[PDB]
Design a protein around this ligand. Structure first.
Ligand SMILES: [Mg+2]
Ligand SMILES: [Mg+2]
Lengths: 99, 48, 134
RNA sequence: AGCGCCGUGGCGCAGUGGAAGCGCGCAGGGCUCAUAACCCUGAUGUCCUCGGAUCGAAACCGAGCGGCGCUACCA
């Protein structure tokens, strides 16, 4: 089946960080975004079953300017960029996740 | 004829990963509500 | 004749303004650490002080609320379990509501005492005797 | 106040008269391509305090402590 430190990425112009609250089905998920929203995130292609995610993982999420209650993932962090951005406080301190 | 109730992006089927720009539109003639695709790449921002 | 009632009421109000100019506002913000499998609470000593509460009784009450196990490390509580800071904050809120400050009147200077084997509470500002143990 | 119970290894039971126990937990390993299941190895103790017969007690007993249930408010 298998034979068949990268630079962290920052939010910008309609894009931010989110905290997965519950894992939905069919490739959906819900993310509490650090804007005051409990948005729903869809998993994009080239990433759907390319990177595996889990509840409790900081997520880089692109938004939909034409649809404010829906959003889609662009990138997932391996718990190191999360602690980093927490130290620089990019995401509000009211959301603390560690492991 | 109809009126755009709002604008949405609906996700494609299984073998194709992409989001297609569509519009939730209310029909004038009978009152029923439906959804409509918008072709021609740069035209959701034309909808208003 | 209720005239000699208002004067001693005035005397009491002057007593109150003399003794207690400030008339809790001294709860340390419970900044916790949820390290996945682990949880570390450093503020446990500070909340022990600012509430005038001995550490062992507070930590055993925390363990009695939630059936989770760990140790005490260092001036901190290291519990290996899963809890958001909101829920442990809530548990501390309950303990604050019903132990550090009495429901009937605003006070906090009361502390643990042992009046014929349980923990019987008494106050200092007042002189209360209430049987709060469980 | 007296009597019935007890004194953890993180737990519950225990043999309590040779001196550290069993399962549940936790760390680690094994099997498997891999996971779970299964299989092996473990470090944890003043087995609560003080004295006593005893080669020797954690165990057998008693001059104190703590926590449990009743007698029940025992001027
Ligand atoms: Mg190759
Ligand atoms: Mg997508």
């Amino acid at each position: 089946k298998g034979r068949r430190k990268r630079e962290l990425i920052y939010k910008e112009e309609g894009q931010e960080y989110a905290q997965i609250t519950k894992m939905l089905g069919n490739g959906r998920v819900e993310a509490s975004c650090f804007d005051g929203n409990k948005r729903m995130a869809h998993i994009r292609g080239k990433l759907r079953k390319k990177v595996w995610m889990g509840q409790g993982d900081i997520i880089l999420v692109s938004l939909r300017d034409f649809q404010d209650d829906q959003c889609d993932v662009v990138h997932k962090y391996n718990l190191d960029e999360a602690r980093t951005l927490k130290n620089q406080g990019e995401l509000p301190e009211n959301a603390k996740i560690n492991e | 004829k109809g009126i755009v109730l709002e604008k949405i992006g609906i996700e494609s089927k299984q073998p194709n990963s992409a989001i297609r720009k569509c519009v939730r539109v209310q029909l004038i003639k009978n009152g029923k509500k439906v959804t409509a695709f918008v072709p021609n790449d740069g035209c959701l921002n034309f909808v208003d | 004749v209720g005239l000699p009632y208002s004067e001693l009421l005035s005397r009491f109000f002057n007593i109150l303004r003399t003794n207690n100019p400030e008339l809790k506002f001294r709860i340390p913000p419970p900044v916790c650490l949820r390290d996945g499998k682990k949880t570390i609470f450093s503020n446990i000593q500070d909340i022990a002080e600012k509430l005038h509460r001995s550490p062992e009784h507070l930590i055993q009450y925390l363990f009695a609320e939630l059936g989770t196990s760990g140790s005490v490390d260092g001036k901190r509580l290291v519990i290996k379990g899963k809890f958001q800071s909101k829920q442990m904050e809530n548990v501390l809120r309950r303990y604050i509501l019903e132990y550090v400050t009495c429901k009937t009147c605003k006070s906090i200077n009361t502390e643990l005492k042992r009046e014929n084997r349980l923990f019987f509470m008494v106050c200092k500002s007042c002189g209360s005797t209430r049987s709060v143990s469980s």
